[PDB]
Design a protein around this ligand. Structure first.
Ligand SMILES: Nc1ncnc2c1ncn2[C@@H]1O[C@H](COP(=O)(O)OP(=O)(O)OP(=O)(O)O)[C@@H](O)[C@H]1O
Ligand SMILES: Nc1ncnc2c1ncn2[C@@H]1O[C@H](COP(=O)(O)OP(=O)(O)OP(=O)(O)O)[C@@H](O)[C@H]1O
Ligand SMILES: [Mg+2]
Ligand SMILES: [Mg+2]
Lengths: 49, 97, 246, 233, 198, 84, 148, 49, 212, 49
């Protein structure tokens, strides 16, 4: 993304800027209990990567 | 088989002949020549599909007659319209014969 | 949307052209005239204004199109005339800002055939003023007077809102041209200038360029930093330690 | 480490292949004499394909060479590359440089130019195996490839509402026949790219602007008379 | 005078060794990183330099470099033996597709020995060792010795690289294609190579 | 060269004369007129090539057209004449 | 004295030409046609028939003119088809003698794209014989064959 | 060289560079007298070396 | 300034390498040919640029050497980039005999033209005929057949020395030949009047001559 | 140089009082004798003599 839209997008996505896109979010539900090694606040988003 | 043959058309040479005869008067009288007016008057005598070739040939004949002294003024010439459908020409008036 | 366009090309005091301006077409412009009329001269003017680097500029004849450097003459000197000469381009961006870019050319006196070149740029000019008018004085004589850069700077600074920038290095000139969208890539270094000139001159003479063909990957593929900088940072602690030990 | 590096390399390679494939389609069905199409053929070198696969899946067989802290990562890459294909020689150059070479994705790709000539299939474009006009047309094709690639590269450093100008030349254009010129005009028009062509009057393209030149001697000095025409069609 | 880039090229420290190898007939492949890069960089001038000797510097379409002498060559010429071209064409055949899975690029002397014995006709084998020979153990031992000898000659040409140990196991380089057949549109390499070997 | 060999040649033979020029289209009408008069004054034969018929009123001319035909290629040749 | 002249040029089994004969002019002969028609090929055939020295012949593109390239391929092989080929010239001597010079060309089987040349000359041929017919045999219903 | 230069047209670099060799013919009468002096001058070179 | 020959090479060396005589001479010198006074073109060229050629060939770890008699040749070092070879003992017998012929004033009347028969007669005159015969054939006892074999081997070696430049055949007669000064290298073991063994050791240390 | 070599001592010593011609100059051309700057090779060019 260009420098002109960069500040807009960074404000829009806020803390979730560095989340992960995952199109279902139910396939993670079994994996999730294992996450003991991760940032204290993990963000997940659904959509076509 | 035996070699065949094909022939050329002289329509453009004839066109050059009419234009050069029509234009010779300007030099003989040393009359100032303006491409805009001449092209506008001369294109009216032929149909649209042939205009481009007529314009080219007329310019080829006209430039041999003298020069335009205005070219050394540093002032560009304008784009004059010469027919409908939107054809344009750019040239200073020919003064020095 | 609305790609930019080159609008016109102006020559002043070149061989055969005291003051001439060509209005470029949006798609195709065709130069036509008998042998020796001066067509290649106009293209020489265009490219020299575009890339004012005397190390690269070499206008070899179309015959012998692919030979070595050969002579020490670059073929440019003879196209100028005694005194001061100019070559300028007029451009319209997607923003519809009118910018004029060009160079000033002069024959350096001596036994050898050498040339002196200085780039410049003007912004904010009114749409009512043409380059030929800026660069000439309509003195009483039959023929006007071409005015040097000093007179030009004084004349331009008098205008309201018009800015005249005069460059000391080619790098700055290319940087400004890129920022305004006149060229597709910002010529970081001399190597970039060389490749850009290769592109232009290969297009000019025509044919499958040997140099383009050799280094195809160098031309068609962008260089990616992501794969590298991680490992430069991770490698840093070892690099410093090794250097300290030495 | 290991797999993730392989994945980023693979994705970069895949994206480059796809972009090339998109550029490639714009050049289909271009008629230049007997040439009917042009392509940029992209392939992956074997000696690097096997290395990439090994780094992806056999990492437990070489982990000793990767986690040994006496040598850095790029050095590890160079040493692994020499372990495979042992016949390769090294020109007394530092392993660090060979490592950084392995880190650069472009080194994994092999590039060619091909043309679909006449009754034959796809052939590598050699100048000596083409007529004059075919060579000129192929050159123009590759040049527009380069220009498109460069514009895609730089747009991430340019304003969102800026579109650079594009212009190319052709000297002694009389060398091309009418059909080839029609093809070239179609290409440039579809690419929004300007052209300046020089010809000793032999060609009269109806579209665009034309300038007539005549050199004369006036007051014992050389002078060029210029006339212009445009708007036809 | 002399072209500047030519003087630069031959001033390089790598030139004397490469010159010595080239005049011996060695082929430079993509394996030799530095030499191959050097040739890629200075080809335009090295071709002219060697033309002064009536010898041609050719870059094969596969990528490897080599010299070809003319009839008026200023470098003394020498010529390979029949058995040499036989073995070369065999190696070209072994540069196959199943090779990758069969040997992972590393062969042994026995592979070549047995392939040669299996694929060639007996008459030309006798012509190679000696016409008086007939299917005897000593003849086969002599043929093995000759195979090792010619294989070492080819290693000097750069065709084949021995793995660095005393045992006779090696890998085949791309430059072996010089022995190969002519390729026509759609033709299968195995078939054409076999057709010439027959 | 012809003058040099005057001694060796038999008295009664004058050798043939012939030259080429590809991409003749690079020359304009005046230049070609000059070239023709030069070569005819010297009894010199010429063979020239151009995409378009640049010499309509002098010498002979042939027109070549290539046709793809049953998975091979064939060239068709037809002559041209100044007037019709 | 009457200077000698080149009467005609004949091509057999070239790339695009099966058997074609161009009749030259006393002063100027012009070849026209779109790109790739075969004009430069005709030039090349003529010069090959004039100087068969294979060490010299090198047909570069018109672009890249004047660049001493040492190209891998001299560009002649591709202009020939499989089988036997010819290129011949008919000349009228100052003595009004008809002489036919020429060469037999043939591709070499093998990876290297090499070519074979064998010159020849014919004297005293009757004026009624055309080279196109002399070099071919009429086999079948107007389906002639070339002969070695 | 002559024919090839004609074919591609233009000022051939090789022709002009050696124009003496191409235009000026050789003379045998000059050689016949120079044979004697050639012997003498070769002898002189021997002694000088 | 940049892009200037002097940056990479001395002007005189580049001037030498650009000369038309260089390729022939380089090819011959690497082949082992000795250069004497008679072939003026090559000898004068060597004299003109001697130091440049010595510095050039030094890159290969070989010395371009000039004998006091005025003839040049190449002597490779132990780390030579160019292979090195040694002559056969029969070659030595004929070489020393050719030297003794060159010195001999009694045969100066021949004006330099010698015949293979005369050379053979001198050789048999000085060496031990029958014991030298041992090398031609292990069973030789003076038989004329074996004598002819010795003569033919001598003829062959003489031809090989012709290739080394040690002797020139006449333009039309291959049975007669003329000597050159290069033959004096066969005398290197005796040109100084001192203990032979120390001479031998100095030669082997200098790389002139190997044992067998 | 042809005048220098052609005209000999005994008769032309009265002519030699001109500043341009002398005998020693023939040996002075020994410098030019060693190597002229010839470029392209065919047949056999060698030296001033
Ligand atoms: N460096 C130079 N020195 C001297 N005269 C020159 C130089 N460059 C060009 N000229 C002359 O300027 C005139 C115009 O040359 P130019 O190359 O522009 O012609 P042109 O119209 O492009 O011709 P053509 O299309 O036939 O090549 C010619 O007389 C040419 O001789
Ligand atoms: N060596 C070759 N190998 C394969 N095809 C070739 C070879 N040489 C020429 N051709 C093809 O033969 C056809 C004739 O080419 P040629 O150059 O003779 O045509 P032309 O009419 O002279 O064209 P132009 O005027 O554009 O030069 C073209 O398709 C060219 O691609
Ligand atoms: Mg031009
Ligand atoms: Mg052609």
């Amino acid at each position: 993304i260009t420098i002109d839209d960069a500040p807009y997008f960074s404000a829009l996505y806020g803390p979730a800027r560095h989340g992960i896109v995952v199109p279902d979010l139910s396939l993670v539900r079994p994996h999730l209990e294992t996450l003991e090694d991760c940032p204290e606040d993990l963000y997940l988003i659904e959509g076509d990567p | 088989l035996e070699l065949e043959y094909e022939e050329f058309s002289e329509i453009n040479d004839q066109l050059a002949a009419m234009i050069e005869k029509a234009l010779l008067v300007y030099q003989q009288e040393q009359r100032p020549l303006d491409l805009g007016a001449v092209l506008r008057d001369y294109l009216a005598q032929h149909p649209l599909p042939r205009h481009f070739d007529v314009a080219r040939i007329l310019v080829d004949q006209a430039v041999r007659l003298g020069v335009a002294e205005a070219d050394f003024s540093g002032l560009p010439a304008e784009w004059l319209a010469i027919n409908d459908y939107g054809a344009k020409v750019q040239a200073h008036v020919i003064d020095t014969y | 949307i609305e790609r930019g366009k080159f609008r016109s090309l102006t020559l002043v005091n070149w061989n055969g052209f005291f003051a001439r301006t060509f209005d470029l077409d949006e798609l195709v412009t065709t130069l036509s005239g008998g042998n020796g009329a001066g067509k290649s001269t106009t293209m020489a003017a265009f490219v020299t204004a575009l890339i004012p680097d005397l190390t690269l500029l070499h206008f070899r004849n179309t015959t012998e199109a692919g030979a070595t450097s050969g002579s020490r003459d670059k073929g440019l000197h003879g196209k100028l005339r005694a005194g001061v000469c100019y070559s300028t381009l007029d451009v319209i961006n997607s923003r519809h800002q009118r910018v004029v870019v060009g160079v000033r050319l002069q024959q350096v006196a001596g036994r050898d055939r050498k040339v002196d070149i200085k780039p410049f740029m003007i912004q904010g000019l009114p749409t009512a003023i043409q380059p030929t008018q800026l660069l000439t004085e309509n003195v009483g004589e039959r023929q006007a007077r071409v005015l040097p850069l000093n007179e030009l700077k004084d004349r331009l600074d008098e205008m309201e809102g018009v800015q005249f920038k005069q460059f000391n290095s080619i790098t700055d000139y290319h940087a400004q041209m890129f920022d305004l969208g006149v060229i597709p890539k910002r010529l970081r270094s001399a190597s970039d200038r060389s490749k850009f000139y290769r592109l232009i001159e290969a297009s000019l003479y025509g044919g499958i360029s040997s140099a383009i063909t050799r280094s195809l990957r160098d031309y068609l593929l962008p260089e990616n930093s992501g794969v590298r900088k991680a490992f430069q940072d991770m490698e840093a602690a070892l690099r410093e330690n090794r250097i300290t030990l030495e | 480490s290991s797999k993730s590096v392989a994945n980023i390399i693979r994705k970069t390679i895949q994206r480059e292949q796809n972009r090339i494939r998109m550029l490639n389609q714009g050049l289909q069905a271009v008629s230049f004499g007997q040439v009917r199409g042009v392509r940029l053929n992209v392939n992956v070198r074997e000696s690097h394909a096997i290395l990439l696969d090994v780094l992806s899946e056999q990492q437990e067989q070489h982990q000793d060479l990767f986690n040994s802290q006496r040598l850095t990562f790029s050095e590890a890459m160079a040493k692994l590359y020499q372990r495979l294909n042992p016949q390769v020689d090294m020109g007394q150059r530092l392993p660090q440089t060979i490592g950084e070479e392995l880190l650069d994705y472009r080194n994994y790709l092999e590039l060619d130019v091909e043309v679909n000539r006449g009754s034959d299939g796809w052939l590598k474009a050699e100048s000596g195996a083409l007529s004059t006009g075919e060579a000129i047309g192929t050159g123009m094709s590759i040049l527009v490839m380069v220009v498109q690639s460069w514009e895609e590269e730089s747009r991430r450093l340019r304003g969102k509402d800026i579109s650079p100008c594009r212009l190319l030349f052709l000297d002694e254009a009389a060398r091309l026949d009418a059909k080839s010129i029609a093809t070239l005009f179609e290409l440039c028009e579809r690419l929004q790219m300007q052209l300046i062509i020089a010809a000793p009057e032999n060609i009269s393209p109806e579209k665009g602007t034309t300038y007539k030149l005549v050199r004369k001697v006036f007051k014992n000095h050389e002078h060029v008379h210029v006339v212009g025409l445009r708007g036809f069609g | 005078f002399m072209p500047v880039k030519l003087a630069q090229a031959l001033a390089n420290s790598l030139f004397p060794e490469l010159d010595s190898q080239l005049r011996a007939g060695r082929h430079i492949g993509i394996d030799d990183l530095d030499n191959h890069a050097f040739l890629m960089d200075f080809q335009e001038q090295l071709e002219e330099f060697y033309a002064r000797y009536n010898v041609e510097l050719i870059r094969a379409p596969e990528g490897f470099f080599y010299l070809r002498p003319r009839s008026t060559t200023l470098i003394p010429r020498s010529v390979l033996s029949e058995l040499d071209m036989m073995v070369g064409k065999i190696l070209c055949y072994l540069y196959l597709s199943p090779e990758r899975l069969a040997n992972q690029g590393i062969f042994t002397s026995q592979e070549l020995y047995e392939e040669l014995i299996s694929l060639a006709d007996e008459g030309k084998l006798m012509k190679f060792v000696n016409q008086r020979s007939s299917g005897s153990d000593l003849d086969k031992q002599k043929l093995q010795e000759k195979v090792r000898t010619t294989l070492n000659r080819l290693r000097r040409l750069g065709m084949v690289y021995f793995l660095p140990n005393n045992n006779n196991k090696f890998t085949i380089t791309e430059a072996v294609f010089r022995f190969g057949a002519d390729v026509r549109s759609g033709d299968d390499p195995r078939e054409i190579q076999l057709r010439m070997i027959r």
